[PDB]
Design a protein around this ligand. Structure first.
Ligand SMILES: CCCCCCCCCCCCCCCCCCCC(=O)O[C@H](COC(=O)CCCCCCCCCCCCCC)COP(=O)(O)OCCN
Lengths: 85, 72
């Protein structure tokens, strides 16, 4: 053929779907705003959590001392006296 | 007028480049081809691209919608 009859549909192939572009734009806005709200919530967390000491890793002694309160140097004076019988 | 004149060749040299000896080319510059081909591609792509592109815009769309709406 001639030049323009091919350059026309060439440019038309080069250009994209606008419906896809609009859908992607509204989508991206939706999830970006949702993620923005999520990050805003995340930044509100205090440095020290409400539980803190309640956490099992932050006790480390309520389940260690009971198995140590029997060794010498930690016993209540009234433990060795009546342990004989 | 009737007399032919003088000054067989116009004075001065184009682009100040001295003419080469007869039988030899102009010895094109090292950037001459890469930039001339660039100019050629730009001219052709603007000529055939800006015209073969669809005339989609907001002026023509508003024109069509104003013609269709003014009748009512
Ligand atoms: C010393 C030798 C120099 C030789 C130069 C050429 C010889 C002619 C000299 C005269 C000067 C001509 C300069 C161009 C004037 C163009 C005027 C008409 C332009 C115009 O309105 O029609 C457009 C044509 O686009 C086009 O295709 C225009 C193509 C022009 C290409 C020029 C490249 C310049 C690059 C500069 C880049 C600078 C970038 C800065 C941002 C589209 O019209 P339309 O809207 O109706 O659409 C049509 C849809 N059917």
């Amino acid at each position: 053929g001639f030049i323009m009859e091919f350059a026309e549909n060439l440019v038309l192939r080069l250009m994209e779907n606008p419906e896809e572009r609009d859908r992607k734009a509204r989508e991206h806005i939706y999830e970006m705003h949702e993620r923005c709200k999520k990050i805003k919530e995340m930044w509100a967390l205090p440095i020290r959590p409400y539980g803190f000491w309640t956490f099992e890793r932050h006790n480390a002694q309520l389940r260690w001392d009971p198995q140590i309160s029997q060794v010498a140097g930690r016993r209540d004076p009234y433990d060795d006296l009546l342990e004989d019988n | 007028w009737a007399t032919p004149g003088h000054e067989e060749r116009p004075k001065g040299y184009f682009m100040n480049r001295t003419p080469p000896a007869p039988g030899q080319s102009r010895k094109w510059e090292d950037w001459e081809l890469p930039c001339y081909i660039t100019s050629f591609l730009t001219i052709v792509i603007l000529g055939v691209g800006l015209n073969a592109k669809p005339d989609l815009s907001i002026e023509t769309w508003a024109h069509q919608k104003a013609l269709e709406r003014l009748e009512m």
